[PDB]
């Protein structure tokens, strides 16, 4: 199981994009695309920009 922490808040522009705030710890589900990663934050799930997070371990 891998996690990433948000370096900045991310405000979705399209459906399917996971909203988050600086410091939120997101669970990685997929990171095949170097630009858009897929993660889980509580009961919310979606894709987000990889350049918005960094390893949380």
């Amino acid at each position: 199981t891998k996690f990433v922490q948000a370096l900045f808040d991310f405000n979705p522009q399209e459906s399917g994009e996971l909203a988050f705030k600086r410091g939120d710890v997101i669970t990685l589900i997929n990171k095949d695309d170097p630009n858009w990663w897929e993660g889980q934050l509580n009961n919310r799930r979606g894709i987000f920009p990889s350049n918005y997070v960094c390893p949380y371990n």
């Binding site: 399209e14 858009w36 920009p49 918005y52």
Partner: peptide, 7 residues
């Protein structure tokens, strides 16, 4: 914050 990547 960096610009969001092309969707």
């Amino acid at each position: 914050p960096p610009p969001v990547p092309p969707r």
